[PDB]
Amino acid sequence: ENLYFQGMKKEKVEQILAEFQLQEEDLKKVMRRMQKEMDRGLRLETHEEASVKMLPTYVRSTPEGSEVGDFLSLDLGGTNFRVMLVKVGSVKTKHQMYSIPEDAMTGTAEMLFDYISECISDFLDKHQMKHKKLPLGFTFSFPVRHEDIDKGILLNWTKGFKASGAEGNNVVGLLRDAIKRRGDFEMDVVAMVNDTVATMISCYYEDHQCEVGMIVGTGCNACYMEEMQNVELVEGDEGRMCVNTEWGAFGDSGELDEFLLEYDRLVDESSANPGQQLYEKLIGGKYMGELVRLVLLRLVDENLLFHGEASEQLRTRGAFETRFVSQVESDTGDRKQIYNILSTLGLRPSTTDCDIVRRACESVSTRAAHMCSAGLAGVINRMRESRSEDVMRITVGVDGSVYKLHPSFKERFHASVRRLTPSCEITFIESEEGSGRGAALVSAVACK
Ligand SMILES: Cc1cnc(NC(=O)c2cc(Oc3cnc(C(=O)N(C)C)nc3)c3cc(C)oc3c2)cn1
Numbered sequence: 001e002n003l004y005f006q007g008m009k010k011e012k013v014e015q016i017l018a019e020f021q022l023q024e025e026d027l028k029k030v031m032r033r034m035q036k037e038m039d040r041g042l043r044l045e046t047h048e049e050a051s052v053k054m055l056p057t058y059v060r061s062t063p064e065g066s067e068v069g070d071f072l073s074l075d076l077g078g079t080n081f082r083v084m085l086v087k088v089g090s091v092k093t094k095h096q097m098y099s100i101p102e103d104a105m106t107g108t109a110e111m112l113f114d115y116i117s118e119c120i121s122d123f124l125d126k127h128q129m130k131h132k133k134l135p136l137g138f139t140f141s142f143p144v145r146h147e148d149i150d151k152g153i154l155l156n157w158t159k160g161f162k163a164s165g166a167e168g169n170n171v172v173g174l175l176r177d178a179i180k181r182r183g184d185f186e187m188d189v190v191a192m193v194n195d196t197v198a199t200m201i202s203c204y205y206e207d208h209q210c211e212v213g214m215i216v217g218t219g220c221n222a223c224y225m226e227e228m229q230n231v232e233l234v235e236g237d238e239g240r241m242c243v244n245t246e247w248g249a250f251g252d253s254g255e256l257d258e259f260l261l262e263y264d265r266l267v268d269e270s271s272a273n274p275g276q277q278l279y280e281k282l283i284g285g286k287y288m289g290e291l292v293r294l295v296l297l298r299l300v301d302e303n304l305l306f307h308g309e310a311s312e313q314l315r316t317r318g319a320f321e322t323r324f325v326s327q328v329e330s331d332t333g334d335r336k337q338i339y340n341i342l343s344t345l346g347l348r349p350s351t352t353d354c355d356i357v358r359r360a361c362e363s364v365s366t367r368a369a370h371m372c373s374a375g376l377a378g379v380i381n382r383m384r385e386s387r388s389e390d391v392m393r394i395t396v397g398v399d400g401s402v403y404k405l406h407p408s409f410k411e412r413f414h415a416s417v418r419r420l421t422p423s424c425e426i427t428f429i430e431s432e433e434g435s436g437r438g439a440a441l442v443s444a445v446a447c448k
């Protein structure tokens with residue numbers, strides 16, 4: 001054992017972990033670069049080259065007028081596929097979750113939308129309604145270049161999705177064609193929204209100050225209410241339109257280069273979309289645990305962890321799940337949670353190993369919270385400027401397992417947003433069934 005040696009080991013761990021550190025000035029730099037990229041995406045002259053796409057959603061600030069009745073909602077791209085029946089009068093919901101097979105997410109668009117339509121049929125039978133033709137709202141968690149609220153092309157798949165025959169095509173069309181091939185129900189697709197947009201809309205229902213939507217789950221993204229005069233891609237300068245930032249692609253033109261560590265390059269190189277969604281790759285739950293796994297292998301290689309031996313499970317891709325980062329950070333101090341996770345990964349951890357794993361986890365999750373804060377602060381700061389407000393009071397609607405379930409992420413992120421947003425009063429609100437509800441609310445408003 002030896003307490004002097006255990007300590008020397010932790011000091012070398014720290015020297016390696018220090019590379020994850022971001023100073024307040026680094027965050028301001030990241031923030032200013034994000035803001036610079038947001039200006040670029042919005043303008044007709046730089047839009048095509050901008051990494052931050054600032055996509056117009058065609059979701060407009062509207063005086064009101066919501067339709068009443070039953071609305072169907074689809075949710076694709078997060079954790080599984082969701083069908084929701086929404087009753088607008090007051091709003092009450094009925095919903096079901098379906099696990100997407102790998103062969104559908106990685107095969108053809110036809111296989112993907114065929115399975116989606118099968119699930120819709122199953123929801124409609126379970127609620128005895130495959131006869132009623134309802135207005136349908138679609139939450140599709142991928143970058144889309146809209147022509148309208150109900151017409152838009154998939155730019156590229158993100159988060160490991162790889163279905164062929166989808167990119168370059170109208171997503172509403174793919175969906176509608178799949179419903180027709182099946183021929184056992186009818187739906188009128190009225191709106192297609194990003195998950196950030198759906199979250200902002202359902203959160204707004206509860207707090208009219210909500211004009212920003214943020215997702216920190218499998219992926220990381222944000223939307224906000226932009227002035228129509230700043231939305232150059234849409235003719236008109238009156239009122240506001242929701243803009244899908246698609247901020248996950250920040251750094252794809254080299255904007256984050258000085259901050260990318262070896263672990264970031266490896267995660268990127270072994271991903272389905274290399275060289276893409278690099279800022280998301282620093283924060284998203286699809287990558288967080290993999291980043292911790294990589295740091296642990298580096299520490300095993302320096303003979304600082306697990307007697308310099310890594311098990312087959314520790315050398316398995318995606319074995320250190322993001323939920324384990326959350327669970328390791330939940331540990332009360334006894335080390336029991338850390339121990340069980342490590343034992344299940346075929347390791348024989350000492351008390352010191354448990355503490356080192358704890359440290360690698362906090363170094364990755366604190367970096368994610370800090371990188372994510374520079375992005376939110378850039379959006380909020382830009383809004384304060386555009387609205388020419390001395391003190392801007394805004395509510396941010398947030399969804400996703402990383403922000404929701406990670407034990408300290410949310411706190412580190414809020415504190416870092418606050419530091420970067422002086423003269424801003426930000427209220428953070430967590431969405432209760434965010435996406436589904438949101439896509440149906442936009443549908444009720446659109447269905448006039
Ligand atoms: C074509 C088109 C263009 N823009 C929109 N625009 C919209 O649908 C719409 C709905 C919104 O949120 C709502 C949430 N719930 C309700 C509600 O209480 N209902 C009963 C639905 N209403 C609005 C918000 C909130 C902001 C900041 O912008 C919005 C736009 C919709 N369709």
Ligand SMILES: OC[C@H]1O[C@H](O)[C@H](O)[C@@H](O)[C@@H]1O
Binds near residue numbers: 142219
């Ligand atoms: O789901 C979270 C986010 O993940 C990825 O960044 C997607 O490209 C974006 O559309 C989505 O909002």
Ligand code: NA
Binds near residue numbers: 237
């Ligand atoms: Na405009």
